[PDB]
Amino acid sequence: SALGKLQDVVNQNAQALNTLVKQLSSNFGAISSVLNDILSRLDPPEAEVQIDRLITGRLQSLQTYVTQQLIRAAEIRASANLAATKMSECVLGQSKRVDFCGKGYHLMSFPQSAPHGVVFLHVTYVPAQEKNFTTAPAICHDGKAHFPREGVFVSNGTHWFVTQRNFYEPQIITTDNTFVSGNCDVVIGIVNNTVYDP
Amino acid sequence: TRAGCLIGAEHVNNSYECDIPIGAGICASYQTSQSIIAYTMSLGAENSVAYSNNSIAIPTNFTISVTTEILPVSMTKTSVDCTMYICG
Amino acid sequence: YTMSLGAENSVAYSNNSIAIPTNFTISVTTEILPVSMTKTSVDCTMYICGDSTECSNLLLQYGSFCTQLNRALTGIAVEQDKNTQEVFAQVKQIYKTPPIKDFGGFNFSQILPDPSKPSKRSFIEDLLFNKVTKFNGLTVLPPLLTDEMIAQYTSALLAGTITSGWTFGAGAALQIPFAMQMAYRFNGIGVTQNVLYENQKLIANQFNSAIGKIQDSLSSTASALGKLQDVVNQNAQALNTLVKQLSSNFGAISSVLNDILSRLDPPEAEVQIDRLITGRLQSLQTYVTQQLIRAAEIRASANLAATKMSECVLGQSKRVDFCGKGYHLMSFPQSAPHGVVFLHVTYVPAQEKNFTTAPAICHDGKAHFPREGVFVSNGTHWFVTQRNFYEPQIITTDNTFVSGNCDVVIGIVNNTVYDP
Amino acid sequence: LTGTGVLTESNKKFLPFQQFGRDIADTTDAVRDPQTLEILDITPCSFGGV
Numbered sequence: 001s002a003l004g005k006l007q008d009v010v011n012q013n014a015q016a017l018n019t020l021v022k023q024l025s026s027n028f029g030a031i032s033s034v035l036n037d038i039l040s041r042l043d044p045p046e047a048e049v050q051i052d053r054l055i056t057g058r059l060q061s062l063q064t065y066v067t068q069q070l071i072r073a074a075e076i077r078a079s080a081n082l083a084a085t086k087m088s089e090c091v092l093g094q095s096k097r098v099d100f101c102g103k104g105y106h107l108m109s110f111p112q113s114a115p116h117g118v119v120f121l122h123v124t125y126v127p128a129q130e131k132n133f134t135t136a137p138a139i140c141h142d143g144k145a146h147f148p149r150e151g152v153f154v155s156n157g158t159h160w161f162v163t164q165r166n167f168y169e170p171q172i173i174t175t176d177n178t179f180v181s182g183n184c185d186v187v188i189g190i191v192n193n194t195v196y197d198p
Numbered sequence: 199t200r201a202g203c204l205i206g207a208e209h210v211n212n213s214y215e216c217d218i219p220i221g222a223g224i225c226a227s228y229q230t231s232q233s234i235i236a237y238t239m240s241l242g243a244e245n246s247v248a249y250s251n252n253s254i255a256i257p258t259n260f261t262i263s264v265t266t267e268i269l270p271v272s273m274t275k276t277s278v279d280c281t282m283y284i285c286g
Numbered sequence: 287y288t289m290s291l292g293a294e295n296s297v298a299y300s301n302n303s304i305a306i307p308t309n310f311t312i313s314v315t316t317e318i319l320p321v322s323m324t325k326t327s328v329d330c331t332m333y334i335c336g337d338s339t340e341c342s343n344l345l346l347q348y349g350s351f352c353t354q355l356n357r358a359l360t361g362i363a364v365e366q367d368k369n370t371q372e373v374f375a376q377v378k379q380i381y382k383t384p385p386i387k388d389f390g391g392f393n394f395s396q397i398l399p400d401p402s403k404p405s406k407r408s409f410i411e412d413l414l415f416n417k418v419t420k421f422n423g424l425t426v427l428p429p430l431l432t433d434e435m436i437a438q439y440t441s442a443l444l445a446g447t448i449t450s451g452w453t454f455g456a457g458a459a460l461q462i463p464f465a466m467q468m469a470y471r472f473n474g475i476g477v478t479q480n481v482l483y484e485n486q487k488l489i490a491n492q493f494n495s496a497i498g499k500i501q502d503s504l505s506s507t508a509s510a511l512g513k514l515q516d517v518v519n520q521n522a523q524a525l526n527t528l529v530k531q532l533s534s535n536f537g538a539i540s541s542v543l544n545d546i547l548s549r550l551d552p553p554e555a556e557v558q559i560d561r562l563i564t565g566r567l568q569s570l571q572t573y574v575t576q577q578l579i580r581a582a583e584i585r586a587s588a589n590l591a592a593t594k595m596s597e598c599v600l601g602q603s604k605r606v607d608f609c610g611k612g613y614h615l616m617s618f619p620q621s622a623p624h625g626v627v628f629l630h631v632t633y634v635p636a637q638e639k640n641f642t643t644a645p646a647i648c649h650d651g652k653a654h655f656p657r658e659g660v661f662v663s664n665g666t667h668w669f670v671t672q673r674n675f676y677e678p679q680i681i682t683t684d685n686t687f688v689s690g691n692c693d694v695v696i697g698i699v700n701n702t703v704y705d706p
Numbered sequence: 707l708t709g710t711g712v713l714t715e716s717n718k719k720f721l722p723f724q725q726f727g728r729d730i731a732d733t734t735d736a737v738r739d740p741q742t743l744e745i746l747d748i749t750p751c752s753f754g755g756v
């Protein structure tokens with residue numbers, strides 16, 4: 001049941017073809033549904049009246065089939081354009097669009113062929129094993145605010161560290177991962193702590 | 199129901215996923231002595247984030263997951279001659 | 287009159303002049319997108335003849351046309367259900383907002399559901415739903431999800447976006463203070479976090495004022511929700527035309543089939559019933575074709591809404607003019623009749639001043655290029671702002687890097703580089 | 707006028723010269739009894755989908 005989208009198109013096309021074929025078993029108000037019978041049982045002056053109704057019916061059926069086929073080909077073209085954009089933005093390069101090439105942080109996609117379709121193997125990065133940590137926007141060492149450069153200030157309860165935003169890697173808060181900007185009485189939520197100078 | 203009268207199913211006071219769509223918030227499923235049950239579909243679990251002004255959660259591990267995305271590309275190319283369908 | 291394309295502005299361009307904004311305004315826009323149509327089914331046997339048998343026998347000679355129309359309408363209904371299932375159900379666990387609402391100063395009480403109503407919608411959603419407010423064979427099928435379920439989905443998405451940021455659409459939702467979330471989203475457009483951690487009060491005031499202005503605009507002006515009313519008007523007009531097509535004669539002696547079956551004999555009534563059958567069948571086929579063509583555009587709009595729900599609310603987008611006019615910060619989803627309404631919070635710079643700039647500076651024969659910044663001047667002294675917010679810093683060897691000599695770069699200027 | 711549907715007493719303000727009644731869909735929903743001067747509402751017979 002996984003390859004359902006690819007099978008639905010085939011089923012719709014088969015149903016359309018079968019209906020177009022079965023539309024030839026109708027008389028549309030005539031005496032028969034076979035032109036051979038009408039032509040071998042009636043004279044040309046009187047058989048055209050019966051042939052015109054079949055012609056009108058079959059023409060209407062064929063026009064309906066062509067209209068439905070164009071409407072379906074529009075959706076198929078939209079899906080093909082989406083698949084091409086995905087192939088260009090996730091197989092030939094890493095993407096940053098959320099929920100565009102899988103759930104999680106996109107890493108790489110692998111193209112795989114399929115009957116009248118394409119299957120993408122989206123390798124994603126899903127974080128796990130969360131853990132609670134108390135945090136502060138910055139710190140006050142000598143009356144100045146030390147905002148982090150790339151990370152977040154966390155504390156295990158007693159000591160303050162600086163780690164990443166997607167993976168817990170505690171490091172000593174030094175003046176190489178934090179920048180000083182402004183005083184220490186304008187930011188709400190700041191916590192006093194020491195900054196190590198190598 | 200808000201979509202009509204369902205004759206043949208039993209209305210349970212539980213909430214499960216949607217198997218057979220019926221109408222406005224009503225779904226059907228063949229679950230337990232077996233019978234068809236009608237119920238109100240559930241949108242999901244009721245989680246509650248421990249939000250505060252001085253707490254943050256940082257993941258310590260990770261998991262690489264590979265999912266599949268199936269997209270149709272083309273259809274069967276067909277050609278219908280009118281002189282063989284309307285006539286012949 | 288001849289329409290005007292706008293004002294005639296003239297950017298004062300020069301090889302040694304740059305404009306760096308000194309302030310900012312938090313704007314909140316509104317984008318409305320139609321997501322679903324009205325699920326309608328048409329019994330062709332009841333619409334073409336009506337409680338009759340001879341006309342049904344005459345119509346059975348036309349093949350599998352009513353089956354085709356019913357299949358097309360059922361596919362349209364399933365597509366409309368998929369259109370609203372793939373937009374509001376991008377979350378597995380229904381999140382809830384904490385009781386204590388302390389988000390740094392951002393007031394979400396007017397965007398979050400209120401206990402006043404039976405835990406159904408919010409003030410903005412109530413305005414949206416109050417602003418866009420059994421037949422001869424036609425029937426309207428109700429949608430799978432109800433207004434309450436779509437509203438609960440939007441509330442869960444909002445709670446997740448407020449209490450976790452973008453960590454609830456990429457795995458497990460982890461808690462984070464809203465101030466640090468706003469700082470991290472400011473660090474994604476070019477501005478540093480020290481600007482937010484010092485103008486948080488002004489930012490919260492501007493956000494509250496923008497939400498109030500959005501509410502006022504929704505209350506006073508009712509012409510905003512036009513894309514949602516247009517679809518309803520088109521569907522109603524299509525249904526009205528399909529109903530009024532039952533009054534035409536199409537060459538027959540009467541539009542009512544009972545008046546024909548009670549006046550003529552079966553030998554002569556078939557000729558008068560065939561005209562009505564053909565006319566009503568052509569009308570119904572035209573209606574179905576137009577409905578499919580309209581459902582195509584509605585599916586396109588629903589896919590656009592799913593895209594603006596995935597990488598716009600469950601993450602910050604860097605696509606220009608895709609999630610608001612300006613630097614996107616955060617978007618908020620709101621339920622609407624047959625549609626979705628986004629509230630795009632965008633960073634808009636303002637109050638820019640004119641400074642003189644240089645590509646690099648030469649200190650000891652070697653060139654110094656900024657790591658992340660632009661060299662500016664107040665007239666006599668050289669500084670460096672970040673990219674968009676004027677924060678003059680002393681040019682040290684920690685915010686610049688040396689690359690070659692200053693004899694190949696056009697625009698070099700002699701200046702002192704501070705060594706700590 | 708021949709057809710089918712439930713007949714019920716209507717509260718419409720028929721005029722002394724009006725005999726029939728049509729809605730916005732050009733459908734007869736009210737008639738006057740040719741014997742008793744009473745207006746009856748013609749509501750369609752019950753139907754739906756299965």
Ligand SMILES: *[C@@H]1O[C@H](CO)[C@@H](O)[C@H](O)[C@H]1NC(C)=O
Pocket residue numbers: 130131132248
């Ligand atoms: C964080 O705290 C909340 C509330 O006590 C708790 O439900 C959650 O499990 C904690 N997370 C972890 C894994 O520390």
Ligand SMILES: *[C@@H]1O[C@H](CO)[C@@H](O)[C@H](O)[C@H]1NC(C)=O
Pocket residue numbers: 156157158159
């Ligand atoms: C916090 O971390 C420090 C350094 O790793 C350690 O010495 C201390 O025991 C930890 N405290 C707690 C409460 O875990």
Ligand SMILES: *[C@@H]1O[C@H](CO)[C@@H](O)[C@H](O)[C@H]1NC(C)=O
Pocket residue numbers: 188189251252388
């Ligand atoms: C955080 O919230 C608690 C409870 O409302 C409050 O007592 C505390 O002062 C707050 N801290 C800051 C600085 O936001």
Ligand SMILES: *[C@@H]1O[C@H](CO)[C@@H](O)[C@H](O)[C@H]1NC(C)=O
Pocket residue numbers: 140190191192
């Ligand atoms: C930080 O230190 C200053 C000066 O000692 C003091 O006034 C302030 O209360 C301290 N704040 C905290 C978070 O302890």
Ligand SMILES: *[C@@H]1O[C@H](CO)[C@@H](O)[C@H](O)[C@H]1NC(C)=O
Pocket residue numbers: 258259260
């Ligand atoms: C992360 O998970 C793997 C197995 O999934 C385990 O071997 C490893 O110890 C975990 N990391 C930590 C820090 O516990």
Ligand SMILES: *[C@@H]1O[C@H](CO)[C@@H](O)[C@H](O)[C@H]1NC(C)=O
Pocket residue numbers: 308309310311488637
């Ligand atoms: C920035 O603009 C706001 C009004 O939006 C004003 O209140 C504030 O004083 C301005 N600040 C600066 C730096 O001019």
Ligand SMILES: *[C@@H]1O[C@H](CO)[C@@H](O)[C@H](O)[C@H]1NC(C)=O
Pocket residue numbers: 392393394395396
């Ligand atoms: C938020 O605004 C509403 C009015 O829209 C007000 O009643 C409420 O007290 C405000 N809440 C805060 C956080 O000030």
Ligand SMILES: *[C@@H]1O[C@H](CO)[C@@H](O)[C@H](O)[C@H]1NC(C)=O
Pocket residue numbers: 664665666667
């Ligand atoms: C430029 O800035 C320096 C340092 O703030 C100041 O001493 C000097 O007067 C300023 N000059 C002008 C023209 O503003």
Ligand SMILES: *[C@@H]1O[C@H](CO)[C@@H](O)[C@H](O)[C@H]1NC(C)=O
Pocket residue numbers: 301302696697
């Ligand atoms: C900048 O433009 C002016 C005016 O054309 C010119 O005189 C000057 O030499 C130019 N300087 C540079 C950086 O080439």
Ligand SMILES: *[C@@H]1O[C@H](CO)[C@@H](O)[C@H](O)[C@H]1NC(C)=O
Pocket residue numbers: 698699700
């Ligand atoms: C910069 O200084 C060098 C000598 O140190 C000199 O040759 C050059 O002309 C100066 N350039 C400017 C911008 O005056």
Ligand SMILES: *[C@@H]1O[C@H](CO)[C@@H](O)[C@H](O)[C@H]1NC(C)=O
Pocket residue numbers: 740741742743
């Ligand atoms: C028809 O005759 C009946 C019985 O006498 C009488 O009740 C009724 O009013 C008459 N109706 C008309 C239209 O004359």
